[PDB]
Amino acid sequence: EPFDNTTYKNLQHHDYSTYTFLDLNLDLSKFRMPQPSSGRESPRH
Amino acid sequence: SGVNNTKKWKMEFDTRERWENPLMGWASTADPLSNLVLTFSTKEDAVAFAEKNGWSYDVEERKVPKPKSKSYGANFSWNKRTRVSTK
């Protein structure tokens, strides 16, 4: 609660590793909305 | 892609024998009309010339390229096959 403007509070990112970003994306998938569909599996289909 | 040699009508004659010169191997001919080409503005002009000169002729109608529908935005279509996979 003290307005201590003398410390760097962004220290979490010093523990991230090789798969931090893609692990978060995996957890986030349960939240996303259903994706829209163009209608075909690919432009080549 | 230039199209400036497809503007005018031409009249040429049937191809006749060429053979190998015994001495040097050059292409010999006995056809006096082998290199003869005439240029006209219209088919009716070309035909009239052949008629008065007594030559039989087979006319071929001009081949004009068809108009195409070009769209640069179609290269990134959302649900169509016209989407390109590379630029």
UniProtKB/Swiss-Prot annotation, chain A:
The family line of this record is: Belongs to the complex I NDUFV3 subunit family.
For the modification Phosphoserine, which residues carry it? 42
Task: Outline the subunit composition.
Answer: Complex I is composed of 45 different subunits. This is a component of the flavoprotein-sulfur (FP) fragment of the enzyme.
Q: Where in the cell is it found?
A: Mitochondrion inner membrane
Originating gene: NDUFV3
Highest taxon, organism lineage: Eukaryota
Task: Please list which residues make up the signal peptide.
Answer: none
Can you name this protein? NADH dehydrogenase [ubiquinone] flavoprotein 3, mitochondrial
Q: What does this protein do?
A: Accessory subunit of the mitochondrial membrane respiratory chain NADH dehydrogenase (Complex I), that is believed not to be involved in catalysis. Complex I functions in the transfer of electrons from NADH to the respiratory chain. The immediate electron acceptor for the enzyme is believed to be ubiquinone. May be the terminally assembled subunit of Complex I.
Coiled-coil residue windows: none
Swiss-Prot record, chain B:
- The range of the complete sequence contained here reads 89 to 175 of 175
Please list the residues that carry the modification Phosphoserine.
Answer: 85
PTM comment text:
Phosphorylated.
Compartment(s) where it occurs, according to its Swiss-Prot or TrEMBL record: Mitochondrion inner membrane
**Quaternary data:** Mammalian complex I is composed of 45 different subunits. This is a component of the iron-sulfur (IP) fragment of the enzyme. Interacts with BCAP31 and TOMM40; the interaction mediates its translocation to the mitochondria; the interaction with BCAP31 is direct.
Where does the record place a coiled coil? none
The task this protein performs is described as: Accessory subunit of the mitochondrial membrane respiratory chain NADH dehydrogenase (Complex I), that is believed not to be involved in catalysis. Complex I functions in the transfer of electrons from NADH to the respiratory chain. The immediate electron acceptor for the enzyme is believed to be ubiquinone.
Region annotated Disordered, chain positions = 61-87
Q: What is this protein called?
A: NADH dehydrogenase [ubiquinone] iron-sulfur protein 4, mitochondrial
